Amino acid sequence: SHMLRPVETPTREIKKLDGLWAFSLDRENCGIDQRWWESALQESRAIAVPGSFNDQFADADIRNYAGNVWYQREVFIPKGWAGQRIVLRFDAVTHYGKVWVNNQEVMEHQGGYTPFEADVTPYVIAGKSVRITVCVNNELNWQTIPPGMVITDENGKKKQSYFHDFFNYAGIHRSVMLYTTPNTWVDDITVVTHVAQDCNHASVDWQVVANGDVSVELRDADQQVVATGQGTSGTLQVVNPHLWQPGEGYLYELCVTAKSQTECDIYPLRVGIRSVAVKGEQFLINHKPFYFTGFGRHEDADLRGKGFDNVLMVHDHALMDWIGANSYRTSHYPYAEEMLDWADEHGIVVIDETAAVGFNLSLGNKPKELYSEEAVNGETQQAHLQAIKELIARDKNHPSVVMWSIANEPDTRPQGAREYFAPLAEATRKLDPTRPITCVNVMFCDAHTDTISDLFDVLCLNRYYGWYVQSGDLETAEKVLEKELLAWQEKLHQPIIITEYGVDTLAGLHSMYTDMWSEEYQCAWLDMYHRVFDRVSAVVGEQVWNFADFATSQGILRVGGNKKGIFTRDRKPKSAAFLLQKRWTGMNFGEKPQQ
Amino acid sequence: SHMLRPVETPTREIKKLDGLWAFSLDRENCGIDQRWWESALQESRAIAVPGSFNDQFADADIRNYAGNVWYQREVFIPKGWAGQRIVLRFDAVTHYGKVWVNNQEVMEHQGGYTPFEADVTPYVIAGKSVRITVCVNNELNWQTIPPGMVITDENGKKKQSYFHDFFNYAGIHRSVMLYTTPNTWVDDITVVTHVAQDCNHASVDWQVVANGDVSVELRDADQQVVATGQSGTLQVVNPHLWQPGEGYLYELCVTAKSQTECDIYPLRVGIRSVAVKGEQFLINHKPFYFTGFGRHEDADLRGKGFDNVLMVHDHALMDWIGANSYRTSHYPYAEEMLDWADEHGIVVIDETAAVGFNLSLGNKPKELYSEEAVNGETQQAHLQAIKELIARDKNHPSVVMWSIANEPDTRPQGAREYFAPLAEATRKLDPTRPITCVNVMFCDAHTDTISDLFDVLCLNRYYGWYVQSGDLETAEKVLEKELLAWQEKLHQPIIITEYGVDTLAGLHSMYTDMWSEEYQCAWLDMYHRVFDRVSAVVGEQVWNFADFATSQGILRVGGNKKGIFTRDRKPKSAAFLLQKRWTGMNFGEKPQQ
Ligand SMILES: O=C(O)[C@H]1CN[C@H](O)[C@@H](O)[C@H]1O
Ligand SMILES: O=C(O)[C@H]1CN[C@H](O)[C@@H](O)[C@H]1O
């Protein structure tokens, strides 16, 4: 389904619906029955949008709730939008949302992390107030991405189980907006940027969907039109192009114009002229080997759960720049698109990942066979392929995105894993031939055990030697780590990114014994992993788990959450922060370090 | 001087300008000479609006920067706005803003904490993109509210010094926005809300400033019209009284009719009255007992920046702990907080940025009230600060009292003659609510001169902390003795507007000694036992709701640690001690004995 990022243009207006909404639980599950969307939510309180609903109220009972919740506000449609295509859009509703404009149901979506939107024109009058009601469901089952099991106790009270290591935050996490186009409008663009080997010339393929004649012009940073073309498709030539390079991010603008006899639409699409290719064991960007540094992240912070926030984005990017990070992965769900707009503009390299985590009952009563009709089945695979389609639909034109991760840490031991994953790998490549693909690999599915990694282009490993196994023993951990990395190099001859390596670290726990949970062990352990990486030629990246401490469901393994942060959840540095800064700022930009 | 909260109506639209702006420092103070507003800011970076610029970048050199900073962004004016009045409004810029539209200067403001707007219709074209540049200055001198002193070191690099115990956060802390009116518009409203002793009747006065034919209607909560007029009084049988802890709201719709154009503006109204009666604070002719906090506009990363989730959460916590009230220590808060307190029936002491009129808290002018310090030109700004606050909040039923200064020194030469003209000029700017002045720790019953000019006595006390340190026994006697001495002197209502001790979350002690969680509990306990045994005390506002940032010093362990909650909003044991007292008692009534 076509999904361009709304942008204000001579032909296009946006009105944000972010702010205080009315909010109500639905403990009874009668809000659909009683059509709660007809009148004011009856027992309601104020809530911030965007935000997770769970932590806004300092209330355990709302935090831990499973079921439906209701959001509602009134909004004036701009007078002067009369005779315009009016769209209502939600950047994200976690995990499921149904929307009513007054009494007309207009939208339904499953998938907590990518946008959905409807033509609401026939259900609103320009200059009049409208009521927008949302039913938001946070329940996971074997056909949701990610999967889960609702457990219903003898009293019929629901309790979400899930297999991923981060809290099941829900609500309207990202901006809600009414926006306009002319009734003739550009509905979809696809740009591919080819780059010659000598880097001295580049072609830009375009493809456009719009109910009118299409023209495009390519403008550089100085606004100088550098190329033009006509019709739904073609190829712009660019001599001596300003390449989009990691650390710089030079953007052109592709102005696409949809022109009927009466009216016209204008969409500016930012373009980074760059190519991305695996070549043996090297990850090439503009024909030059790249070395990833930086983090697995999460969309997580105090009070707002996974809600988008501009101060948080500005602050975290200052921290990643300070520390010398050149890259990250959207672990483990599509991130707010303003993150990909920031990366495009600042030349930050991103591994874009789906919400497909938790396909693994072995990370600790769960179904006996992971790949079966009672768990991951043909429906689950369909839901997964849909998850992949929406992510690529959103993110295909972000030059910051260099690789698709279609899943995180699935159990690949069973016969079934390869039957499930092979067609998803093939479909992903069809949806976007321009980027390499990966499936992030769990520690127990080692080089000798794993049955799917040959189907993907880049080997993305999550390794905790010296933490979950060889606990506290850097000596034995180093031998085991180096042995396995070389066994993967021999097995597949792919580029290897260590997408996770980290240890829980209590900020302020200090030890002369350099033992587990201390700041000092975090430092020694990352240091050991770095020496190993620098001795294996197939290793082309290191992404520390995690940028910051983050919330998980409660358990004996999590001291108030996951403490593998380099920074605390309030973004204060642990000692290891200064260790990463030395290594990452001390290396040459984008180049594998040396002994 | 006319300040109406922009709200959307059939005749009034709004576009928020909040989001990422371009941002630059101006170390070389050459921005105005090079007229930076004429081009895109050079060597800029993204900043979030709203929020302080100081903590967004984890960079000490920006955090501590003194001088001018530049914000810039482009924005499309909506096509349907052609032939309407286009305003540009900043809800707050700390401490000074000057604003250009393309190449045209449109406004200036001094005052970190209140709105300012210009009609920009002539310099914008609906359906075109225009560039908004803002030069924001964070410097404080003896004429700014609040005061400080700038030192230019050996290289022209400024270094700011100030006399208040909260960090000097600056930037565009609140919403920026374009909004429309018809060329005929409502431009101002005042509303007074008399309530007969019986309570079973009430009358609402209304004045309006509009360049067209004024008509008003007052609807109740269910949108049933309940009065009408064409200046005037509306009458109301068995009125729904705005009551603490409920906050019933009516809507005064105010129409401004030309033959050509019409303008509607709804204004929420709470039918309540507030007066002192001897030793009692009275709302709707009932004795009230204030509980809750001195607060701050302070949080991780965003500084004093307004945030929706933070507002929703902090209110959630106050609710849970049983707070009915707070003070806007020590500056006007974001209007949203008062729109909130209006709806939920929270009581608010609304306070000016006038704090640190003092040189003895914890090189500088040897005479506080002099030409080289707090002079007549200072008294003026202070009056201008009092004007702008009442111009914005005169209509909020939550605002139960004005606070015209916090912790002014009262010993130096000619305190009274400085303040007498301000307490007068306050009651003339609005006589509907009592006024107060917050009374610093060392300015005791004998020392203070000024208390007599004000309706309610607001004490900040710290016995057992800054004095009689860690001795709760000696601290109790000295506190009781002093609150009785204050009864005898003024027979006014006594609110403790600050009582708090620095408490390091996780510091546990068997010896119940200073900085421990246990000390915070045993000490608030003692202030509590005294409060109850003194008929004159009609309020207790704990200092502070949460840990907040200060300037660096030997007295501040990473900031002020007097919070009941940490900066990340986690409770200390004292959160549970206050929750028993404040919810175990009766809404708005002093406890027994
Ligand atoms: O902390 C950990 O152990 C890691 C393990 N690997 C998963 O991909 C992460 O979600 C996180 O749970
Ligand atoms: O923490 C303190 O000591 C208090 C004393 N009184 C002031 O009004 C507050 O701003 C704060 O400095």
Numbering used by the authors:
A (entry chain AAA): -1 to 362, 369 to 599
B (entry chain BBB): -1 to 228, 231 to 362, 369 to 599
Reproduce the article's own wording on this structure:
Siastatin B is a potent and effective iminosugar inhibitor of three diverse glycosidase classes, namely, sialidases, β-d-glucuronidases, and N-acetyl-glucosaminidases. Surprisingly, siastatin B also inhibits both β-glucuronidases and human heparanase, which cleave β-glucuronic acid residues but not sialic acid or N-acetylated sugars. Herein, we show through crystallographic analysis of protein-inhibitor complexes that siastatin B generates both a hemiaminal and a 3-geminal diol iminosugar (3-GDI) that are, rather than the parent compound, directly responsible for enzyme inhibition. Notably, 3-GDIs are a new class of iminosugar glycoside hydrolase inhibitor, that have been shown to inhibit both GH2 and GH79 β-glucuronidases.
